[PDB]
Amino acid sequence: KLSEHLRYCDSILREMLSKKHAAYAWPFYKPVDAEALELHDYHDIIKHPMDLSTVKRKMDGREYPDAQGFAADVRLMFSNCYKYNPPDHEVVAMARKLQDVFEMRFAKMP
Amino acid sequence: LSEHLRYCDSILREMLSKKHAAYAWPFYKPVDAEALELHDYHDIIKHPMDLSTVKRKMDGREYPDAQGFAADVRLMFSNCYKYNPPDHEVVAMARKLQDVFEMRFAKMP
Amino acid sequence: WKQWKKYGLKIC
């Protein structure tokens, strides 16, 4: 049901959501609830929200055609974090630390 | 409100200020046991308390004296200490916030 | 996870 490339993608998605990286992956677990976190401007600047919860739903829904479309949403997720938060925020360092994990395993695929 | 509780609201205002947001934010709103999936929080903590609840009682003129105000603020910290393990970071944040409260509160006529 | 404004805290 899943291609060989997308099998590796789902395994990558699984590691990013594991207990291993929970110290810095937690900001990206669920979609940004602008009201629940009192960030009333998130949707005035981020017009295409994305988070790991949304990404897994699209993966299980078989909505990703290739690995490129999967990499697009995860990189969009980090771009939303970098575009909205100040550069010195610790969550930005968490986005960096989590993306550095993603880019590593994603680069090692045939 | 009497003159004593006027100073109390100023302490509550400082506890809710921009200054202490780094460690006071867990105690801003009540503990949502369902949003955190802690089915035992209300089986162990029978009197939950937070700073929002304290402000409602302060604005509602429900505190008779400053002692009743300090009782609920210490109950809030006591709730945090009773449930979480001592090595949890919430304990370190509760102490540093309580350390601020006890300092302001001890200096009252 | 207690959340609020881009802060976080593992209670469970």
Author numbering:
A (entry chain A): 307 to 416
B (entry chain B): 308 to 416
C (entry chain C): 1 to 12
Manuscript excerpt for this entry:
Within this class of proteins, the bromodomain and extraterminal domain (BET) family contains four members that are transcriptional coregulators and that recognize acetyllysines (AcKs) using a tandem pair of highly homologous bromodomains (BDs). Despite heavy academic and industry investment in this area, the generation of paralog-selective inhibitors has proved elusive because of the extremely high sequence similarity between the bromodomains of family members (90 to 95% within the acetyllysine-binding pocket residues). Using the highly conserved BET BDs as a model system, we conducted three mRNA display-based RaPID (random nonstandard peptides integrated discovery) screens using a single library (which contains >1012 unique members). Crystal structures of 13 distinct peptide–bromodomain complexes revealed highly diverse structures and binding modes among the cyclic peptide ligands.
Likewise, the most abundant family identified in the BRD3-BD2 selection (BRD3-BD2 family 3, accounting for 53% of total sequencing reads recovered for the top 500 peptides, including 3.2C) was not found in the BRD3-BD1 screen. In contrast, 3.2C bound to the BD2 domains with affinities of 10 to 100 nM but did not bind strongly to any BD1 domain, consistent with selectivities of >10- to 100-fold between these domains. Like 3.1B, both peptides bind two copies of the BD. In contrast to 3.1B, however, almost no direct contacts were observed between the two BDs, suggesting that in these cases crystallization might have promoted the bivalent interaction. The two AcK residues (AcK2 and AcK6) in the peptide each engage a BD via the AcK pocket although, in both cases, the N-acetyl moiety lies too far from the conserved Asn (Asn391) to form a direct hydrogen bond. It is likely that water-mediated interactions are formed, but the relatively low resolution of this structure (2.8 Å) prevented us from directly observing solvent water. The two peptide–BD interfaces bury 1,120 Å2 (BRD3-BD2-A) and 1,116 Å2 (BRD3-BD2-B) of surface area and the peptide contacts very similar surfaces in the two domains —a surface that significantly overlaps with the contact surface for 3.1C.
